[PDB]
Symmetry: C3
């Protein structure tokens, strides 16, 4: 009778409750209060309704999906994945997520509070998988949206350590899909060989998706893995903050990137990276331009800490047959980055910023401009030949450097004979501090190695802070690089003993709208007259010089060379010195040569 | 007997429980465990205690208030607003919040976990309202405090889309009141026409109030709305972080601001704004100085992303009959901001920083100083005439710009004929990079248009990075602007073809403590003597010049002009050149003119 | 029979439940659902199982420990400390935490959701204590680890106001121990006299430990307290973000620091400090080098707001008999800091950065380099004599300043007669803006007071932005300071009336690899010849000068002095001017003196 009802599954539905014995409160039943929360245990049961304990020999997938499906049908809620248990997944999902090698299908308004651990069983060894998928169709173009889905807690997603079976396979933790107001917070992703841990958005469809306070640990482990980017941000108004990324595999030093920022109004801030090849790509792929336009703008990489083996930030933009991608309005600021201990040339070329070619190697498709790199530090150990503040390997329409501290082998670099980028609006302000770790290492090398097709509307203000007499020059332009409407200066400090300071192998510093200054040694000879007397250079390669002035003391009593010099049409320098007593004088002086500055 | 007790509201109070069958655990009753949590369902009931389903025809207000009142009486706790339901509010509250058009009264230590949706019913159409109010008196001066009140969750506050009925009305989401350790986290505020979404503090009373990870979407929709600021921060030690603000209304481009920082030790960081007129005001209003003093100091606007139509940061301070407001010790850093696509003059004048007058238009009441603007980017499209790095429209006691990238029409601007601000300690360091988007657009315009009453103790170091021969000058001072104890320099790069570089329409560069340098074209003529020979300017307006030097090459073989020049009392320049052969020479040379530098 | 079972502690275990009457859901018992959560009430009971109310006369310690012990035995979970109650602790713990004066022992995977208040009873008055301890052994070297332990919520830890009984005692809130993935979030620590509130890690053992959104209020109150650092970060990959620190005690202005960053890859960001002596130490102690190596690198102090009375960031490194500590790769950025109102010399010497000696006073053990200080503001009121951008008191191997705004008494300072640091790679870029608050206060003082044993590979580019004729010099080197391979420049702006600009009391600016420039007044006299005519200095102390140029106008019609000058072997300057009419001329001119620049 009553006893039967009480012991039945409807029993709690018969036991009355009123909150805190408050006579103003609702007269409820116990079941109503229990129904305010929901866990995996409410679906983790056999066909007779008996609870099943999780474990390595139990496949929890169908139970978790049934939980998600049911809570979705009531307008959403939060399913707890209980602490103190490991929940194994041991089969693929069915329906719209099967095209994505999906395990679990996420649904709108259904949050997951992961307190325990979710592990992959060895069914997945050597196979593709995406553990949580928010697409609802195998074809992403035909997918509905995922909205208001949050995964959070103190728990763990463990990928079982399994290697990839083939390089062409894809593996992911969370693919939110066409995702609006979705987020992952607090979760540890660990122990795998995967392509991505989390992907946000799809080809610009989505908004307001975030990854916050998550850990990603040891997510590459094999030579089969083609590539890895821990978070791929493929919708606007989205980003990554306060996360921790670590790899230990040798392969990760060559293939793994922490973040991809691929749509406008996206950010990467406050995070720590160790053991990765790359920090972040900031890219507009034409192939990804469907949902949010063809421009990646308002891109922010700030206040991160990194030890990487390749490049910290990589910029790109590219084209398809019918769409052109553009990258502009970027800020890279406050980051403290180093190339980890490694041999020269043992990983991809070390760089703070890389202007990279497209995925096919094309360097003449990019449209990258209005970038600001400010207030960052970069260090590479002295042996790492392949380290640069910027490797400028594809067409650049602008990039501005102010008030950074770069301590590596090169400042600006591109390999000769390779690509010949067209460079516009490259600005290197004098407030960039050039470190001394690589002093004495630079035999045969140019600190600024301007291996470009052409440079226009650019500024390079070189300022040393210590000597490095091993370098061939501070800045060199090969004769193949056109230079125009530019300002190139070499501050004299720490340069007195340098054989070459600025080198223009095509004599490009003569251009009508080139503004330069740099130190040089010049031999002069005077006329014999007592009194005010001209001094003239012996060499005739100064027809471009607008003024010069002495950087040398005068050890003579009986005369003095000119303090300042102009030129003559034959290319000599000329200035008026003073012979206290007459005689032809011959001196070698260090001058600051100036053109239009 | 027993069956009756079990089915009664005291039934759960008779059913024993011990945690996990642990014999060391408390012998409790089921009701005790259920009493550890509380939801709206525990109060959302008719007078007989029967639960009422929420819905558009049910007014949930009295039930939610009864929940808050009761939990307050037990020392606090957290009330869940359940997921999967929309809870409508359909009447005003009563008592102390009625003076505030209040709906719900918040209470100390009573948190709200909003997982579902709270909507406004059409009772509120065309009426004022403040949805959650923490004042306890209609007169804020007579209000008690609100302490330890947190609103958080994945849920939503929806204002029903209703327009304002009259411009003089006020609408708000959360007014914490005189608020100490209060916060909103995770919540989406959307679909309204309101004055504010959240206000913190009252006239400096409050502390440690924050808005974190919230979304504000479409909160202005009509021409009736007088003004909108999404978060108003009116207590110290408080701020906004990691929020998302978006508007779509045309009206928002003219009236809406994201944040007001109005008391000391307040911050706005890490947020994204789109569609707003303004980013943040940083202001000390004398009228708001009661609870925390008359100074706004330690004000921080950092690492935000914005597309706005008017000004990004607006500074102010003002006076009342008996109190004077002061603003100092401000930092604006790491922000990436653009003026969105619009016609020139179609919204309030575009600016990165505005020094604005008080609410009555007064420009002679401000006391603003010790501000640092560093490491920001700003862009405005080329057609937007009305765009400036700084619009300096009221008295300024100091502002420092270092290492920014500004790409807009003007650097410094104020409209002539308007206000004549008194300017002190304006510092524009040479490390500020001036972009080229507006090159060729500047006919008739001065890049730095110094339309002030006076300038003192100021530094303007102009550095171009590309040519713009359309501009009238790089910097111009009208004769009405006094200039003293200042340093004004124009770097020569990209200026060779400029007719005017620096212009001093009152000849102010002659001042005893003015330090200047800029390029100019000068005609000279020599004496006929063979050998060392003087050259003299034909014009006599150089009595202020302390030295000059050549920026031009010398195309002659038979002579050379001086490399460097001094002046003479009649205002000629003079220097010593060299005539290899005699003859009177006549040349036109580009010189760098220098005074005391 | 059945009634007996129902009223027993196993009663809930007999009442059936199925979630939302879903026939696909698990057939459970009420007890199963209640067993999904756990609170202190489940252990806060007498030996017969009757619940005990908390209160000032009840010691809750044993109950909370039993809760932690039991949840640990099931693999972890989260224990709620209920809102609306104050839980008092009134005795020490036992076992491994007794060596640490421990109260509660934390355990792996057992989180604490503190919603109510935890108070200390007066048993603790005048005694040591560490409230929560994660070590499991009295000897930390023999301790196991604490993993996956999070303390969070809206609640409060209150230390009872009790003073220290003796300076040698230690008091702490949370010692996580050898701690991996542990964190504190949201908690208020208040009302004490303690050594630390939170400590992370032990001598480099630990990882991924964080303090986020916590408040620390009034944690020093007596003259007995030897020292206080609110958070001590002693494991890598760990940090402090978005916290609030306030003190009101006079003693805190002399003894209290907010944060210690003592291992690599640690951070302090986004926080607000008021009332403290110090902001953060960034230190590698050799004595703490066991778990993570001998180097502190990737150290980040960013975007903080502070009012302090001593120093903002303090750098250090030191040695033991067998280990040497090194500090490198540091970034200090975006901070807005002021010295609070106080009399000169009334608290430890005010500084933005201090290079401090070791704990024994040794200044010759440090290895600190590759530090970047950029984009910060610092202010000290005009009366505070003891205020500096950097106090450089121990050996320094490098520190770089770019684009800061420093407004205080000194730029670089060390006390004479004290330590004589060896300085390398000190870089002060010209983009640092020097404020004017202390103008007129600097009688007898040098703005840059270079009281060092030696300076090498250093750059000081002085740029004033207003006049201060009270200062003795802009930069002074005593004869005891060797100077070599350095660049020292004084911009002329605001210096015309200064008696001394740069001072080299040992004539160090003559060094072969010293690059300098600064203004000076020089008396010259010409020969009598009409026409081009030499001018020579009367004094002979210019043998080091490579060029000089006029900073003065020429008030004469009949002649002009040289615009530019070289030197002669006797130490005179010499240049060629012009006598329109003959005669011996005598002039006093302001020159820019230059050596190798
Ligand atoms: C690891 C990584 O991100 N590397 C980037 C590089 O990214 C490109 O190359 C990677 C290689 O893994 C991706 O291309 C692979 O995956 C795509 C997408 O998979 C299909 O679509 C998804 C939605 C579905 O779930 C899957 O089942 C597949 O059907 C394949 O089409 C492609 O053949 C394959 O090699 C990456 O693709 C992007 O991936 C993100 C995140 O999942 C998606 O949001 C995008 O839609 C998808 N883009 C496109 C154009 O399909 C490639 O873009 C970058 O290009 C490079 C420089 O920026 O940096 C790293 O090397
Ligand atoms: C939209 C906005 O913030 N605009 C600012 C501008 O702010 C001033 O103008 C706005 C217009 O809405 C506010 O003035 C309106 O509201 C105040 C306050 O309302 C009364 O007090 C509150 C506590 C109570 O709940 C209400 O029922 C009212 O009784 C009215 O007094 C005033 O008449 C009316 O126009 C704003 O007032 C401030 O509002 C904040 C946030 O609610 C309160 O904390 C302050 O106490 C209150 N200040 C004062 C002095 O009363 C005005 O300050 C800024 O001035 C401007 C430049 O900084 O930027 C934007 O335009
Ligand atoms: C307040 C503060 O941090 N001051 C720093 C200063 O720190 C050193 O001085 C303080 C003074 O309180 C600490 O030294 C005291 O404590 C240590 C450690 O206590 C023992 O070990 C812990 C684990 C155990 O729980 C305790 O029961 C004790 O057994 C004592 O050994 C020492 O005698 C005593 O004076 C501080 O020690 C460090 O403390 C942190 C945080 O608890 C531990 O993680 C470290 O292991 C421990 N270090 C060492 C070497 O033992 C001292 O390091 C800094 O040195 C200074 C400059 O950087 O700034 C502040 O003044
Ligand atoms: Na697919
Ligand atoms: Na730029
Ligand atoms: Na070429
Ligand atoms: Na009112
Ligand atoms: Na300033
Ligand atoms: Na005037
Ligand atoms: Na101990
Ligand atoms: Na450095
Ligand atoms: Na010495």
């Amino acid at each position: 009778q009553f006893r039967a009802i009480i012991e039945s599954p409807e029993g709690a539905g018969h036991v009355g409750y009123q909150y805190r014995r408050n006579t103003g409160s609702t007269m409820r039943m116990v079941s109503d209060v229990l129904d305010e929360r929901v866990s995996l245990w409410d679906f983790h049961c056999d066909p007779s309704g008996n609870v099943i304990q999780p474990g390595p020999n139990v496949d929890s997938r169908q139970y978790l999906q049934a939980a998600i499906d049911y809570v979705s049908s009531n307008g959403g809620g939060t399913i707890t994945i209980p602490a103190g248990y490991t929940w194994y997944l041991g089969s693929y999902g069915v329906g719209g997520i099967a095209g994505h090698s999906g395990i679990i299908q996420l649904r709108s308004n259904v949050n997951l509070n992961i307190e325990g651990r979710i592990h992959l069983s060895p069914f997945f060894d050597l196979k593709p998988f995406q553990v949580f998928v928010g697409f609802d169709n195998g074809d992403p173009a035909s997918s509905g949206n995922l909205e208001n889905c949050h995964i959070y807690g103190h728990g763990v997603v463990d990928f079982g350590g399994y290697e990839f079976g083939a390089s062409s396979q894809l593996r992911n933790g969370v693919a939110f899909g066409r995702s609006y107001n979705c987020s992952v917070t607090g979760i540890t992703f660990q122990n795998g060989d995967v392509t991505w841990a989390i992907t946000l958005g799809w080809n610009g469809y989505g908004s307001n998706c975030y990854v916050r306070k998550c850990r990603f640990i040891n997510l590459v482990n094999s030579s089969v893995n083609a590539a890895h980017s821990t978070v791929y941000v493929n919708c606007p108004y989205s980003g990554v903050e306060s996360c921790y990324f670590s790899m230990s595999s040798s392969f990760a030093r060559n293939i793994a990137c922490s973040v991809q920022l691929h749509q406008h109004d996206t950010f990467y801030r406050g995070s720590t990276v160790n053991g990765y090849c790359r920090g972040a790509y900031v890219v507009m792929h034409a192939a990804e331009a469907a949902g949010a336009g063809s421009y990646a703008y308002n891109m922010q990489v700030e206040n991160n800490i990194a030890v990487i083996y390749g490049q910290f930030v990589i910029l790109g933009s590219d084209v398809t047959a019918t769409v052109s991608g553009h990258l502009n309005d970027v800020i890279v600021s406050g980051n403290i980055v180093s190339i980890g201990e490694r041999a020269a040339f043992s990983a991809p070329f070390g760089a703070f910023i890389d202007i990279g070619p497209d995925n096919s190697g094309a360097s003449n498709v990019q449209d990258i401009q209005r970038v600001l790199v400010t207030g960052n530090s970069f260090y590479a150990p002295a042996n790492i030949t392949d380290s640069a503040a910027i490797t400028l390997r594809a067409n650049l329409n602008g990039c501005t450097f102010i008030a950074n501290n770069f301590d590596c082998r090169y400042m600006v670099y591109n390999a000769p004979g390779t690509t010949s980028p067209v460079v516009q609006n490259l600005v290197w302000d004098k407030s960039n501090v050039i470190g001394g770790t690589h002093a004495n290492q630079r035999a045969g090398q140019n600190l600024f190695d301007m291996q470009f097709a052409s440079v226009v509307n650019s500024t390079i203000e070189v300022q040393l802070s210590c000597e490095d007499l091993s370098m061939f020059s501070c800045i060199l332009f090969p004769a193949s690089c056109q230079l125009s409407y530019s300002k190139i200066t070499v501050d004299s400090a720490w340069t007195k003993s340098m054989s070459n300071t600025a080198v223009f192998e095509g004599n490009q510093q003569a251009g009508a709208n080139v503004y330069v200054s740099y130190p040089a040694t010049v031999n002069l000879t005077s006329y014999n007259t007592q009194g005010a007397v001209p001094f003239f250079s012996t060499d005739t390669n100064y027809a471009w010089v607008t003024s010069a002035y002495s950087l040398s003391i005068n050890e003579n009593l009986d005369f003095s060379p000119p303090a300042t010099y102009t030129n003559k049409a034959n290319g000599q320098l000329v200035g008026v010195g003073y012979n206290e007593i007459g005689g032809v004088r011959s001196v070698s002086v260090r001058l600051m040569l100036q053109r239009q500055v």
